[PDB]
């Protein structure tokens, strides 16, 4: 057992497909997810040629350790991929077709700036490594690159799951790699965010601004300080499903801006005060009577600029 | 060891049973359950039959490696199931009983619409894929299917595990795969939900209108943004139980609307306030009187229209 | 190797002991214990048996592989436990002993009636599953049941650790099983549980009642609300550390009366307030002044009646 | 392989050691520890004794499975321990020397009466069971037990790691079994509990004193009702990150105590109110006088009690 | 198989390379991290040389097991690495190029010290220990330290991989061990630590000193210690992130200065309202008016000698 030897000096093709059959665990803080699929591979090895007549059987069964089976593995995983072979079979000629059913931890970026509306490309990248005697060369064989129906992954919708076909091939430590690129892509169901969060935030908000109608101060300030601790809240639930990054993310921003407003109407509810101990309501009257309308006007601008800058 | 061949060009049938031992683990969140049992299967290999009389023996026992044993798999598991063979059996016309048991943790999605008063139904997923010499199709044997009585489901009542005894037969990459639907039956004991979420919120929502009696904006204030806080805990504790869905919960209804009753009854208690400062005290108090009445009565009529859209 | 034959018709008896040597994670939620222990397996297997003259030796030894070894099999765990063979020894009349050293995760109900005062039994059941040639029956030897005594589970008195000595026998799925019930008896520490949750919520239930001791609405309403808002916290932390059962448990009920004492001190406020607006303070006064004996009274009576009701 | 017989009729002495070389996760909850470290066994074989002289080589090796290797294990372990053989080095003598780098979980209780100013011993015990044909026995090579400079555990000081060098040899099921107990002696770094958990729990509590410089009935149930709320999450926090111990621990009480405080306020604080609107200041006044001395003095006196009890 | 010898009396030297494929969970709390990478390792082994006339092939392949490989360990890991043999080459002279793709989890200690702003070298330790025929010796090939363009390790910048070239070389239980450094520079992208953390904690801050520009008790009491409390919370959520060090984090000592400023807060909204109560509104005047500058110049120069103290 090592590499069939080339009839001229080309390299050898192994060609593979990815089925998935489940997916689950989009873990949006690790950035991974977890696959359970056929990874099916095949390949032309000459010394594996038989005759149906002088062996009685037209196809050969083979077990794992009998023939010459390419070292492919996945680049972005945890640990190295649990597999079952399932089979493996031989036609005449020497062509392999292998199947295996494995299950992975795959490790891959998200892009959260668009949070909780965005869309992601998950890969799941296929290697070789080429052996001393030859050029191992990757390709996708279309015919067995799919996942089935029921495949849902839960809080997202699958678009689609196709390969790039053109393998990367490139030199790592004095032997030629050949890698290539599945692509999953989905996009996050932002459904239940509108009445678990942000609503919920909204209406905190909006009941702050109930401020503007009162000239008790005691009142307002018990309010105003009351509703940014309840934020406060959903910042801190907010920022514990996601990980940390080095760009702001839409919700990100929409929570961060919503405290500039708790401390503006903070301010003005000092200031109406202020003014009325110091026996001139009539300023702090108008104050008020401004911010009214300020207040929902530059929050609804506000969110308009942002939404155009995210989207 | 290879399979064994047609007598005719029939199917190889595998007739399968599973018998639960345990079941734990009902996670909502990850949508899935951990199961512990027996797993038989049943098939002819004639190459193993043998004579009666001149034999002997009943049956034969053998071990695993021995014979040709079909590759059935899960659908819908994590990762492939643990198994210890318990036994094979070999009766004199070459009929083969096989008994394994195995624990695996499944994937099965829930319909969260009727939570807490949701039934589920869990799936396990039998399968096989032909091999080259001839095609496997697998079948019930009703007699080994079960549970023990024992079995319990924390949180859960179990009403029935039954299979659906008709394969759905299919092609995937070229082979044909045979795939039979055991289905758990289960409905979740909603007992608990009623003293530890449910009343509670009833409580503080009641607690909140008790400002509907009461002149006082500072009294009123605190009185209303208080429960609110406290309605939000109860729901982001809701919420941290579920998985995300893209459609209304009965539960997550409920907890939303009861949003709207606190931004209202602020409303009212900021109406009333304003009125009085404004020196007319009689609207405020006949806005005061209505709303004794239309909150418990809309919030009444509201919470039946609700369970009759939900049930 | 397969099983050793009857000298007569009689069935095969294995004994078992099983010596704990180590108990923890007692995990109340998921309603498992962790277990590391001494397994002894006892039998006769004929086929052994040896002259200890010609031999020169009083005992022979043996290597799990080399001679038949009954199938025993736990049925209440998680995955087959892992084991050690320790050693296996073979008498001259063909008695043989072994002994394994196994740790593994058992799944017992518990009954939370009575908690944080409460009782369990934990159980540990052996069983083993008849073959073609001869039915397999358990039996305790009590010399080789035990535990050590540094065998500590945080959290809980360890009581005793006894075999049912009878096995139940049983058919499944057309095969003879006997199976073993080893019994570990254990009470919960509730010492803890006073300091760090009873008296606390105690305090702030009685610093509401303070409440009637004041002529101030404003006042009030935040005596009332305020630990109403810590209760739930108790009541939060409290519920994530049992699982949800269909039934009420002694501290879940304590909790949420305690809920019916907080509504009904904020209709005593409400009703003492109103009246006072209303120009009566002499019938609030005297609400008052009944509250401050009802309340602690009939909080004591119901208690009364509760822990009888439990205990 | 069996074990090496006896010249006289002595028993078997194998000598041990442990060379620490990681330490981590002391997880308080759980009363665990990992620690990675060379086991070093050695012990005379004479079947495998050579001559120096005549055989040129010095030392001769071995594979594990080529000569009798004493079953040594963990007591205190949640699973048998993961080992990688090193070496095997026997000398002419046929003295064996094994080493092998292992990995475990070790259970050991912790005293928590002092927390967070406590000291350990944690516990690693070596053990063998005596075979059919003689008895082992086990020693320490001190020259073979120790740890390297850089094993850090954190949020912990590392004191010594020593053994007991007298074995405990004892009876179990009818067979000897000797037990060693190597000794890690670890105590706490306390250093951060002052500013994160310790003096904020202060500062709340002294804040909570202003009310005795206050005749605003308002205020005052604001401050202790408030504060007395951010000691319960304290409380809660706390005892999150321990165990549940059947006696009070050092900060456990303290924390109890200052429960008794807040009660204590509040009635203050009531009373000082009541006897106020019932037309008697001065009483009042001189209540609130008292108690700006009396509650700090009878705090320092408190917690000088405990300290003294404690350590 | 065992070492190959030396042609005069020198240590074998191992060549050895570290390639990052992929880092992940740099963890804070367990101070671990995870890595998956090539590890190269070459020697010279003589009794492995041939002729390349003679034999018709340049480069020799072997499996893992019909050759010496030297025992090469991770120091700072938790298990034993997860290892595949990828590929073993041996040229004419008897040069063995061995390579392997490998995970672990890595134990390294973070200097918390200026947390979030900080950066740390994290290590991977290679080890070596000496047969007993001859000394093995480690060396850096930097031809093959490296790491792939796309390894990210989320909320850190990865600055350089390097080994320290020349080997700390010591004796351990009377062998030598031969030991090698290689080192990854990183450090943390502290960017959402601001909007997340930071400026609401600023932000509440702020707002309690709107109390100096108020002369409402009950209103400044509300204030300081709702703010107060947000400041524990953001408190709690900043130390359940990090272990518990020591020693003083930046973050850690502003957050602990805050509660001084909140503590100073109340006394003088506490001795503004006293002064008040007993007539002297004008020495109240200018402490309130003294403060509002106070305690923002104050804030600022302890913030000032912070940085200075830490950076
Ligand atoms: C107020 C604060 C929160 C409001 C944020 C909602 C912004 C959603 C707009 C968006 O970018 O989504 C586009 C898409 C996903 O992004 P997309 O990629 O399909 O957008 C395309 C970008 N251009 C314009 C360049 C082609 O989502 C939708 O299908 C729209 C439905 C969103 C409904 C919003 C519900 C808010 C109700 C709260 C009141
Ligand atoms: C609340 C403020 C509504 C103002 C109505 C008004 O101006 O009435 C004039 C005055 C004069 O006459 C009325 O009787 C109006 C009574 C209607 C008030 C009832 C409001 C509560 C409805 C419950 C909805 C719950 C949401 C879910
Ligand atoms: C408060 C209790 C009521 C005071 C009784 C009274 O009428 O006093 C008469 C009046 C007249 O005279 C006094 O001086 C009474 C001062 C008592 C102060 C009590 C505070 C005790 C602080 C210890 C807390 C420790 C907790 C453990
Ligand atoms: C402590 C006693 C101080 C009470 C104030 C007073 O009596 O004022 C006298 C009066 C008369 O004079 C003043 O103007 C004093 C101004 C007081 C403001 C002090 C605030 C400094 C903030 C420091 C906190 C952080 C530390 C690091
Ligand atoms: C940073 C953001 C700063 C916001 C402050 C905006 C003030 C707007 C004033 C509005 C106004 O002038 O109208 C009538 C004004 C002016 O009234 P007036 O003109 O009739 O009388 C003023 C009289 N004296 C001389 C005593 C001031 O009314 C007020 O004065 C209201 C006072 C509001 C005070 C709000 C203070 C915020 C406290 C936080 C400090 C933040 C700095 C921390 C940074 C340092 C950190 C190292
Ligand atoms: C004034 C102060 C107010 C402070 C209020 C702060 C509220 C704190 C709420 C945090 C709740 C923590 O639990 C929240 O919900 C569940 C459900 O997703 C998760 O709990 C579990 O842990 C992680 C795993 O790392 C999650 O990815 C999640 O899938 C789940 O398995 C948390 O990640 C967190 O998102
Ligand atoms: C003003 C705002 C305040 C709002 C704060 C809301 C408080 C939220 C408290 C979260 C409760 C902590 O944990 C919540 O409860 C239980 C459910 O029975 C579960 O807690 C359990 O704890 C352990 C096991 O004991 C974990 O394995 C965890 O994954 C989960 O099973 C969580 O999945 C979560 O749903
Ligand atoms: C309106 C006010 C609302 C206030 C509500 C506040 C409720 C706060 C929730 C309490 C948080 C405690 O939640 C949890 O309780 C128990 C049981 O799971 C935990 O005990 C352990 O926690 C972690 C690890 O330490 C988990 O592995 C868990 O399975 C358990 O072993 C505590 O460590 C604590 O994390
Ligand atoms: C109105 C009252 C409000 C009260 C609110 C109380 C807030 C309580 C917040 C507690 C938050 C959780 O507190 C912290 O969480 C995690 C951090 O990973 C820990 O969970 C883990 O527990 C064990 C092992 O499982 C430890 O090894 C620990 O270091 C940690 O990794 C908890 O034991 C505790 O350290
Ligand atoms: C995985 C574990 C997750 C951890 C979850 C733990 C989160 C705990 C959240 C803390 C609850 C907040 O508790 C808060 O205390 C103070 C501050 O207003 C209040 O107590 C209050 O006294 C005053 C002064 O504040 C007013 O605001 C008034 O509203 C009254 O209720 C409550 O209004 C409440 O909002
Ligand atoms: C007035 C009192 C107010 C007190 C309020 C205190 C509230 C504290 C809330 C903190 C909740 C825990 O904080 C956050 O939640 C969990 C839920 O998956 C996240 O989940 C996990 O926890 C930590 C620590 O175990 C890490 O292992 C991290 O990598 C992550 O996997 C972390 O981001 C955690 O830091």
Tied chains: 1, 2, 3, 4, 5.
Excluded at 97 to 121: G, K, N, W
Excluded at 164 to 192: G, T
Excluded at 262 to 270: D, H
Excluded at 279 to 294: C, E, F, K, N, V
Aim: hydrophobic residues 45%.
């Amino acid at each position: 057992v090592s590499p069939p030897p080339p009839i001229a000096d080309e390299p050898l093709t192994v060609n593979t497909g990815i089925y998935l059959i489940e997916c689950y665990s989009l873990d949006d803080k690790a950035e991974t997810f977890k696959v359970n699929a056929f990874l099916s591979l095949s390949w032309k090895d000459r010394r594996l040629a038989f005759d149906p007549v002088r062996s009685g059987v037209r196809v050969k069964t083979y077990e794992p350790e009998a023939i010459w089976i390419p070292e492919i593995r996945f680049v972005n995983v945890e640990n190295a991929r649990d597999a079952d072979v399932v089979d493996i079979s031989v036609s005449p000629d020497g062509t392999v077709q292998y199947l295996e059913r494995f299950s992975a931890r795959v490790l891959s970026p998200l892009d959260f700036r668009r949070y909780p509306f965005d869309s992601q490309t998950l890969h799941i990248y296929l290697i070789v490594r080429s052996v001393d005697t030859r050029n191992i060369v990757l390709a996708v064989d279309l015919e067995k690159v799919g996942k089935n129906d029921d495949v849902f992954l839960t809080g997202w919708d699958i678009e689609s799951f196709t390969a790039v076909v053109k393998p990367a091939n490139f030199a790592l430590e004095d032997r030629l790699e050949s890698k290539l690129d599945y692509q999953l892509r989905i996009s996050r169901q932002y459904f239940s965010y509108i009445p678990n969060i942000i609503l919920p935030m909204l209406f905190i908000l909006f009941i702050s601004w109930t401020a503007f109608w009162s000239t008790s101060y005691e009142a307002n300030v018990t309010l105003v300080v009351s509703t940014l601790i309840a934020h406060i809240a959903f910042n801190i639930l907010v920022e514990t499903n996601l990980p940390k990054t080095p760009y702001m993310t839409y919700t990100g921003a929409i929570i961060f801006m919503i405290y500039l407003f708790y401390f503006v109407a903070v301010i003005e509810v000092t200031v109406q005060h202020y003014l009325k101990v110091e026996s001139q309501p009539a300023r702090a009257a108008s104050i008020t009577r401004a911010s009214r309308i300020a207040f929902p006007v530059v929050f609804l601008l506000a969110n308009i600029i942002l939404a155009f800058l995210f989207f």
